[PDB]
């Protein structure tokens, strides 16, 4: 039982991997989702 | 298409945690447990 | 030379002794790589 | 953060192995490897 | 009496693989497992 | 589980000296200990 | 002549260490030496 | 190079091991060279 919504967050995580190709994945990891949470604070702002 | 070497270990790790702590939101988690994560390495790199 | 993957696999075993703190390293050892491979096969089911 | 007794010991263990064995899967390998580990330490204490 | 931190999981990691491979002498197999974790340690700490 | 004979010894022999000597590095210890104790037995089986 | 499991591992313990330490006494070391082989199998056993 | 009564010590300690299949090898040489020590002091008297 994979919950709703997990396996979208990895794949968003992934693409970005994939275009970027960040040195570090750990640390890509950590830039990455911040910026996602940003981004959907600002689609509820709006 | 070639997945780097480490990121499907990093995903699994991840997804492990969300099934065993059933957090109420994944990209809170998301965020605190690859802060944690890096931490964790940092440790075991000045160790 | 290390094998792709083993470093992430060795961290997120070592995060998550950091955060439950476990009576016994070796018990734990075994608990999370059997739920990690659990959570993989969950996760190629899904699709 | 401070990695517990005996952590890096184990991580050590399983990672000499790897690197002798060449494992097809790093996952099952963790699992036979820390299964057998604590077979081992069991004769040990008995 | 005091163990150290570290010295059974060393023992038990020798252990293990003494279990497994079967060497034919104790001695050697010592001599050549704990220089084998030690060049793998030095592995792990040059991929960082 | 079947620990073969000789080993428990081998272990112990190890451990008394590290709670004795109290090596900076319990892997480089190893090393050290039973390379010594390969010569040692080397030294037992020339006298011989 | 069947030698007991163990025998040899004993006394080539003891020998590498009459070849580290250089006693002038071998027969008050072996005392040492094997009182102290007990106390550290003792803390095995209690930890 | 192996110190001088080294070895017949050993081999003295494994013949009464042979002899009595004491059941730990460890308890039996504190014993066993506890009791050579007394025997060596003995003698030197």
Redesign the interface.
């Known amino acids: 039982?994979?919950?709703p919504?997990?396996?979208e967050?990895?794949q968003g995580?992934?693409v970005e991997?994939?275009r970027q190709?960040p040195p570090d994945?750990?640390?890509f990891?950590?830039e990455y989702?911040?910026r996602?949470?940003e981004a959907?604070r600002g689609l509820e702002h709006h």
């Open positions: 039982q994979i919950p919504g997990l396996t967050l990895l995580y992934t991997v994939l190709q994945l750990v640390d990891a950590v989702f911040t996602l949470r959907r």
